[PDB]
Amino acid sequence: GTSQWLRKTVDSAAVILFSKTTCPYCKKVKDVLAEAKIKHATIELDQLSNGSAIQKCLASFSKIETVPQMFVRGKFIGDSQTVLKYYSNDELAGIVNESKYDYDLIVIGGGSGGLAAGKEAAKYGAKTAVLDYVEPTPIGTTWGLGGTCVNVGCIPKKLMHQAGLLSHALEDAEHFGWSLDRSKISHNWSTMVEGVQSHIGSLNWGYKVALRDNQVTYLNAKGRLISPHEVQITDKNQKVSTITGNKIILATGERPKYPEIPGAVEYGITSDDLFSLPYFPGKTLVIGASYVALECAGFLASLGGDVTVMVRSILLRGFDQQMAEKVGDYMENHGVKFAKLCVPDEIKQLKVVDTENNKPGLLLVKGHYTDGKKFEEEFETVIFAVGREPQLSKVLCETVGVKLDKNGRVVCTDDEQTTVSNVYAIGDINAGKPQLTPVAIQAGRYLARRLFAGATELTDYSNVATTVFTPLEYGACGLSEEDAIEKYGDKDIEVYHSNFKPLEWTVAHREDNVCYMKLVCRKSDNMRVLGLHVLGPNAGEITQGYAVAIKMGATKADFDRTIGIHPTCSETFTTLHVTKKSGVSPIV
Amino acid sequence: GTSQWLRKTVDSAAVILFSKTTCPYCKKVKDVLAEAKIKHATIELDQLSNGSAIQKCLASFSKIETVPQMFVRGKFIGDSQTVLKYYSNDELAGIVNESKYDYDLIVIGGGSGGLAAGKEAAKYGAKTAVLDYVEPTPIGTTWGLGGTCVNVGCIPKKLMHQAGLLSHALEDAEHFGWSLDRSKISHNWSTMVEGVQSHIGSLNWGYKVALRDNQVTYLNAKGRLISPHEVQITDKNQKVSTITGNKIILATGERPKYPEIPGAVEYGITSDDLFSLPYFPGKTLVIGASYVALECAGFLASLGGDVTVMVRSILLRGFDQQMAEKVGDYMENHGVKFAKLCVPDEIKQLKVVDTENNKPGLLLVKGHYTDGKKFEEEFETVIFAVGREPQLSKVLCETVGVKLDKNGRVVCTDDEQTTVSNVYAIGDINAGKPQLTPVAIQAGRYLARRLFAGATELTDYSNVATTVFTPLEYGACGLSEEDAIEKYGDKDIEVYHSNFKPLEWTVAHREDNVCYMKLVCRKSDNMRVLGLHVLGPNAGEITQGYAVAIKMGATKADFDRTIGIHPTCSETFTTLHVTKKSGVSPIVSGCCG
């Protein structure tokens, strides 16, 4: 067992040090490499029960069995004696840097997973190179280091969500005694975008510098994979180059799909454009039903905008449809108009964008309904939230032969390994993995540890909790009710559910029976909580804690035994009693 | 033992039916009892691991082994044919009403635990009586059914807390692009208390109906447990009677302590008085350092008040002390003055409460410091929050023999049983139990079930999560740091921790590195999470979910495995790596990277 583990580890590590805490020579060397500013991976043999047979199995690599044993890229370099010998002449900084390639690792793409990976690898020695190029949107939009989430994703999305939530905090303030007129108050999109952009702006820098502070060579270059070890980089002005790499990680992410219809690319905008947009979108049509679509439709509405969402079939496909229904309903009951069962045929420009005045154009959206009826309306802005796609034909020469799936995504074994043994893929592009930022970060960190630090641990992609950040938030962990029903059958699935009202809402004279949560369990299995769902404020803060207990395989009995914190939204989980089969109402 | 149980179920349950889920004549008997509006507990034997043992063992009460078998108050009343025979002759509703005592249960205290228990026992066919009487405070303040939490506790507490959060959310709006100065806006306290009371009003009524709906006899009366089964009662106009009850539930709650100093009861108020006070408190002094003390100081400050807090010794005794300091230092930095190491000596009236203008008085607070300096300041109102005492001397007639402890609290077994074998106490009074609402409700329900439903499960009192609702909230679950070391030794205790900033706080320009969270773990036992602590927004919402995993015995490995939800405050618990004994600083370096 250990024979194969050790065979892969030393071969792939850049700067590694086998050691004991119990061996004095081993700790003395750690002191030296520290004041020599050498980053190395430390395997501690006294803290492992696979280790009993390592010193004996290091005879095949260096013909010795004493600790410490420092390796550099598969080949041995020396123990306490040879390390100090190489130190007292400045020769250590020259020996560690010795490399078969330009870099131990090249990371193509500087987004959530990309950056996370490069930063970790560098910690254990790897001379790392992270490449990031942002390709302009049709209309011309670009941004700094950080990837999707930082620049055009979670960060702006949630700050804008926040601006939107505060719209109703202002309303509620009045009921709680605060003497302010909500009617007289308005929102300045422009002010808000400055705020948001300024934060993103400082995040771009944070990263840029973070890589510097980690001996990670950051290049603002478009990377192309020409051969299993060679990456072709293009700079800000066409100077083509070819750095070599030992390990390759593909972390290039996705971009927003445009529907294949006239006028779309020319007059329509994606989420890429929305977050840095100079002027308030105005009367807006969102075309799509992804969490991206409803999130954006949701915060534009809250900022006093005229918002329509065009929906071809169902909202939030993949998500639990009872909950998606309740999400959509909340939004409809609050001004988001829906064009149900409807597609766009074309987008025609009625009016151009006024820059000198900072105001949107007018656009005409021609489309049809399912029953063939026409659709025709004028919108100031058209936003296209119809899925995202990886564009790896910009990154991969087919002649390297990295296998892509039915829809253009890197097919990987469970170690994020591609069909090409030194090439790896993480994040949004790794087929079948949930497409979320902590998922990519985790995937990346755990991969760096396996490659350049001899770790075993794999990234667990199951029961990864999510939050859709709509006007009323939706938090989820585990299977949707319908999925749970297909897996272990209807008679096996019990659903304990309930409506609830945040105490903050009572005085504020908001809805009863609109906030809602449910637990989806499997009775044959002790009533195992397969799935947790909640619609209400701070849904993500609510959900996060249970994602742990679910990972650990919680049952309904666990939830019951746990005591509530009062007054909170989240507690209502701890005292759930009404099941769906009983037909009893879940209202208060 | 399996038999030991059965005896306990037949002798205690008001109305119980023994059953199988598959047996058609059980289904018929069930349906029949539902149509005749009869409430009963049920035990489905086909889903009890000791099933065939209990069934054969039933013969000692009924003489039969068949199902179903109906029992009322320990009297076996018949098989299917017998019970069907009773149903169409309509004699059934009278056979369940037959009882030796007036009620199967007298609950004394219509508060959190009392109501919770009341409603629960009632559902299984136990005849139930909830007693509630609200003793007015010194200045003469009273409220309706519900208890402390409903009228003068959690509900008004967090509602006022919410109003304090809105203050800072008005500042925040401006940065997020909204058109308001929030520098000229003021807060109208009169409007807020109308709203807060309006709600407590509807909860008063709500709970009253709830009891009636479950056929619980609600008496707005003072309850004296005069004998093991006798409860003497005084209604609205000193008219006395007596009612009997098989089993008694004490859930009388505590009331706020006062100091032994002149002027206190005369000129000062307690939290009971605060949440209905018609005038704005004005320059307020809060004497204490309990969560009530801090919370009330917190939102009063935020609501535009001049607030000083006099601490005898330490902030939040009982709570992890590192967390208590941070909690305090926040409040100080946000305009809450603290007279530290300080106790009051007396209070004197300088102006009388203008009760026709909605304006406070003026009070002289003479006090001395830990060393001598003699403290002496004026305050428009003064609020005492020095802990809360049980008034069992007002309820429990001495001659019964129910053991109280050092502090006047009912000593119970871990099945809530007092020294008098049929009397139980639950909630704030059950000594040495965490004094919280969801505790008092869990205790009540679980008790009611054990008795009248034949359940076995007790209330788990270990690792109960809390959240102090100060300006920046404090959520906590399990052992403090000074207790994890104190019990398992420094060498065993590994503390992971980290500062954080809400993404919401960035644009709004609030503090980086004031929010803090930590995980007190134990090396030997696989890094078992013994404690979780969090200072930051929505701390209640954050903590709750983890209190479930903590319960099941969570290890750091478990937090590590779990993916974060981005962007949330709570997610910082999943990537914690920095430890204390390794020396690395908690501070989040920058907008990271």
Ligand SMILES: Cc1cc2nc3c(=O)[nH]c(=O)nc-3n(C[C@H](O)[C@H](O)[C@H](O)COP(=O)(O)OP(=O)(O)OC[C@H]3O[C@@H](n4cnc5c(N)ncnc54)[C@H](O)[C@@H]3O)c2cc1C
């Ligand atoms: C509007 C929106 C909101 C979202 N909200 C959330 C949320 O709230 N919570 C959550 O968990 N997730 C959210 N996500 C998803 C999240 O953004 C992704 O899961 C995350 O970006 C995955 O990171 P990645 O490294 O795989 O790809 P990316 O972050 O996109 O990184 C890829 C980077 O590589 C660059 N690149 C591409 N090709 C090359 C090449 N030729 N050479 C050099 N560089 C290249 C790209 O420009 C890009 O910057 C949201 C996504 C969107 C679109």
Ligand SMILES: Cc1cc2nc3c(=O)[nH]c(=O)nc-3n(C[C@H](O)[C@H](O)[C@H](O)COP(=O)(O)OP(=O)(O)OC[C@H]3O[C@@H](n4cnc5c(N)ncnc54)[C@H](O)[C@@H]3O)c2cc1C
């Ligand atoms: C300011 C404040 C804030 C709080 N905030 C929280 C919080 O945020 N979260 C939390 O979990 N807990 C909180 N608590 C604690 C919570 O209020 C108590 O833990 C809970 O109310 C205990 O319920 P109980 O049934 O044991 O007592 P109570 O709810 O007080 O029930 C006692 C009731 O019985 C009545 N009574 C007394 N004697 C008799 C008698 N002789 N006959 C008939 N009736 C009688 C009393 O009038 C009273 O209404 C707070 C407490 C206070 C004071």
